[PDB]
Amino acid sequence: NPPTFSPALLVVTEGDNATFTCSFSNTSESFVLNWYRMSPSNQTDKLAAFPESRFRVTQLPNGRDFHMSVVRARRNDSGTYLCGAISLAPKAQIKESLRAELRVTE
C-alpha cells in the first residue's frame, strides 16, 4: 500500500517555495515517514522525517497527508525526490512512493 507523492513533476523559480504532498494511510504498529532525495548516484539520502533545515515535513489536519516543503528553493536542489514509509513493527518494511522531480529555474 505505497505512499503517494505529488505532484509528480514540479517546476518553480529559485527563491520560491516547493511543496510536495506525501499521502500515506497505514495501520502499522510502529513506523516513521522519511523524505528522500536521490544522490547523484541512485542512493537514498534522507532529508527529513516525521517525526524527528529548509526541508520541513508537516502533517496536515486530515492526518493522512503531509507536506514535504522545500523552503526558498535553490537551483541545485533540482533533482529526484520520494517519500519512504518505514515500518518497524511487528514486520519491518520499506514502502516508497514513485519518484517525483523538482526543477528550480532562474
Next chain:
Amino acid sequence: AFTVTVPKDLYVVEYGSNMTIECKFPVEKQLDLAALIVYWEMEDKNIIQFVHGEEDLKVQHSSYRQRARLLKDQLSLGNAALQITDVKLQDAGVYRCMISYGGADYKRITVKVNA
C-alpha cells in the same frame, strides 16, 4: 539526524565465495539493543529481521535461513554487516538495509557476482 551510510555502493564478489556487505550507523557510548532494529532485504525477499536482539525466523524468506547472518559483534561498532555464504548468480542484484535506532534510515547496495 540519524542517517545510515555505506562504505561503497557496489561490491564485486566472486562466485562461490562468502560475502559481507555493510551499512554503518552512528552509535553513542554503548549499544542499546532494545532500541535497535536491523533489516536486510533483496528483491523484496526478506533476509534478516533483527528486532531488539532476536531474529524473527517466522518472517525470514526460508531460503536464507541457513546461508545468511548478521555479524553480531559488529553492531556495537555501528556496523550492520550482512554475510551470505556460497554466493551464486542469483545473489547478484540490489540489497537494501534499514536500521532503526533513534530513529530510522536506509540505503541500497549493488552486488555484482563475478564468475
